[PDB]
C-alpha cells in the first residue's frame, strides 16, 4: 500500500526517589505497532506485538533485546548528563525521548531517514535530511553536536537508515503482507440530530479505516465550509483501525445542500455523502 515507514520510539523518565529510569520502547511499521520493550515488564525482553513478527527466531529477539537495553542505558547516562548541562536539581523527574526510522516509496526504495531527540519535551538535537549533519536547538545540544561530529555518529546512522532499516522494513512488509499491504477504506455513514425546530447537526462518520491518514471536509453547494463545523482528532478503535467524524450545523430543511467528502488511500476516488433521507 503506497509508501511505508518503520519507526522506533523510545521514552525514558527518571525516578529521583528510587531506582532507574522507566524506559519504554515501541516499534511501528506504518500505523501498526509490532514490538515493545517496557522496563517495568517481567520478561526484560523485546516482545512481539503483531503476528507477522512472531516467526523471527531467537537470534532476532536476543539481538533486539541487547540493543534496546543498550538504548536504555544510554538514556540513563543522558538524563544524568543533561541534569548537569542544565543545572537542575537532583529532586525532579525529567524525560528523554528519541525517535528514528525510515520511509520508503511505493517502489519500496529509500525515500528519507530521520533521528530526533528531545529533553523535557522540547527539541534537543536532530539529524538533517541529508543524514550528514545535525540541528542543535540550544548551546547544550551544540556541545553534543560537536561530540557527535567527532565520533562520526551521523555516518553510522546513515548506514543504518539507508541500509538495515530499509532492508528489514521490506522483510516485514513481505512477511506481514496480509495486513500491512491491505488498506481498509473507511466505512462511512451520516447521522442527523435536531437541535431546535430550525437547526440541525449533520455528522459524517469514517470508521474502521487503515492507515490513519484521512481527510473529511464539508461543502455547501459545492464550496468548502469550515464555519459551523467541528472535526475530532483521528482516534484508534483498538483493533488496529481508526475512527474520525466531522460535523456541520445547518438550517433544518437545507440538509441536501451539504456534502461530506472523504479522502483516504483505500478509496480510488474520494467519496461524497449527502443527507438525502
Amino acid at each position: 500500500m503506497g509508501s511505508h515507514s518503520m519507526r522506533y520510539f523510545f521514552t525514558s523518565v527518571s525516578r529521583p526517589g528510587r531506582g532507574e529510569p522507566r524506559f519504554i520502547a515501541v516499534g511501528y511499521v506504518d500505523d501498526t505497532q509490532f514490538v515493545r520493550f517496557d522496563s517495568d515488564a517481567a520478561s526484560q525482553r523485546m516482545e512481539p506485538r503483531a503476528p507477522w513478527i512472531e516467526q523471527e527466531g531467537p537470534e532476532y529477539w536476543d539481538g533486539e533485546t541487547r540493543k534496546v537495553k543498550a538504548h536504555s542505558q544510554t538514556h540513563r547516562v543522558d538524563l544524568g548528563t543533561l541534569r548537569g548541562y542544565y543545572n537542575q536539581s537532583e529532586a525532579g523527574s525529567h524525560t528523554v525521548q528519541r525517535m528514528y526510522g525510515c520511509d520508503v516509496g511505493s517502489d519500496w526504495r529509500f525515500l528519507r531517514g530521520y533521528h530526533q531527540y528531545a529533553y523535557d519535551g522540547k527539541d534537543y538535537i536532530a539529524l538533517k535530511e541529508d543524514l550528514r549533519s545535525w540541528t542543535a536547538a540550544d548551546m547544550a545540544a551544540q556541545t553534543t553536536k560537536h561530540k557527535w561530529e567527532a565520533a562520526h555518529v551521523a555516518e553510522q546512522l546513515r548506514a543504518y537508515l539507508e541500509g538495515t532499516c530499509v532492508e528489514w522494513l521490506r522483510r516485514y512488509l513481505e512477511n506481514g503482507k496480509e495486513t500491512l499491504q491491505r488498506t481498509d477504506a473507511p466505512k462511512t455513514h451520516m447521522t442527523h440530530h435536531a437541535v431546535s425546530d430550525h437547526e440541525a447537526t449533520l455528522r459524517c462518520w469514517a470508521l474502521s479505516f487503515y492507515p490513519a491518514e484521512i481527510t473529511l471536509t464539508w461543502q455547501r453547494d459545492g464550496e468548502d465550509q469550515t464555519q459551523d463545523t467541528e472535526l475530532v482528532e483521528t482516534r484508534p478503535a483498538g483493533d488496529g483501525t481508526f475512527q474520525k467524524w466531522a460535523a456541520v450545523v445547518v438550517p433544518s430543511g437545507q440538509e441536501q445542500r451539504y456534502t461530506c467528502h472523504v479522502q483516504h488511500e483505500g478509496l480510488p476516488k474520494p467519496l461524497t455523502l449527502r443527507w438525502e433521507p
Binding site: 540493543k67 543498550a70 543522558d78 545540544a141
Partner: peptide, 10 residues
Amino acid sequence: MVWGPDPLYV
C-alpha cells in the same frame, strides 16, 4: 530492526 550496537550518549 533497531539501530545498534549502542547509541552514543549526549
